[PDB]
Amino acid sequence: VYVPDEWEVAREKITMSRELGQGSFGMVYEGVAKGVVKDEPETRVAIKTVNEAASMRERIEFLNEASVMKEFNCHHVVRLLGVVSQGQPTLVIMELMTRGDLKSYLRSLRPEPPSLSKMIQMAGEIADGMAYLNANKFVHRDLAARNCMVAEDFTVKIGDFGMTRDIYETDYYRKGGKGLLPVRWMSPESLKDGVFTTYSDVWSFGVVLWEIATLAEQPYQGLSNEQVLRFVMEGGLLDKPDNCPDMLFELMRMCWQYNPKMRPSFLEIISSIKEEM
C-alpha cells in the first residue's frame, strides 16, 4: 500500500484507548475495530502508527512491511486485521495479544517451579509460528521472549514489537554505531558475517528456551556487549539454567550447534517435542 487492497479499512471504525509502547515508525496503542473479524461485532486490536513528522517514503517502508503479513495464516503468528492508508494518522490493525510480551510474563512469575509440561507447551507454540514463518521464506532476525506475545487464553504467538521499547533497551547493542543489534540472541554467523537464515532463528529459539527456563534472566549476564560477541563467536555457550530439565537443555544445545547446518529445522524441533505429549 501503494495500491490500497480489500485490507484497507475506515479510520472511523478504529477507536484508540491506551498506549502499549514505541514502535519503529511511531507509537502503538490499544483500541477496538468493528467488522474486522467475521461473526463478531467489536475486536480488541493493537493499532500501530507512523509519525506526523516522517513523510511519504518512510510511511511506505511501514505499510509494505505490513503487506508481508497479508500472506500469513498461522494461529501462532500475530494476525493482521487491516490497514488505514489514505489519511494523515496512517495506522495498521493487529489482533490484540492481551497478556503482553513473553519476557514481561516470565518476569511477572519471578517474585513468588514451572512444569516441564508448561514450558514444553509454550516452546511448541513458539516453534509452530516460526515453522510457518520459515516455510514462507520469512526470517525473523529478532526472535526473543520480548517478541513472543501472550493471548487471553495463555497461547504464545510470534510477533515483533521492534528494537525500540524503553523497557528492553539493555537488549540491544549499537555495534559500530550501525543498527541496534540483539547481540545476546544472535548466532556466531549473524555476529561475524551478518548472516540471517532460518537457522540464525533456531539459534535465537534456543536462547528463548533459556529465557523460559530462567523466567527471563539477561543471557550471558556479567559479559558486556563486546565480550558476548567475542565469547559466542569464539565457540562460547550459555550455562544450563538452575533446575532446567534435560529435554529442554538438550534442545538448546541442538539450536546452539556452532555450524548452522548441524542445527535443526523448527519442523525437527516440533517433531522432537510432540513425542513428549
Ligand SMILES: C[C@H]1C(=O)N(c2ccc(SC(F)(F)F)cc2)C(=O)N1Cc1ccnc2[nH]ccc12
Ligand atoms: C507492534 C505490534 C506489531 O506490529 N507486531 C507485529 C509485527 C510483525 C509481525 S509479523 C512476525 F511475527 F514478525 F512474523 C507480527 C506482529 C507486534 O507484535 N506488535 C505488538 C503487539 C501486538 C499485539 N498485541 C500486543 N499487545 C502488546 C503488544 C502487542
Ligand code: NI
Ligand atoms: Ni496451537
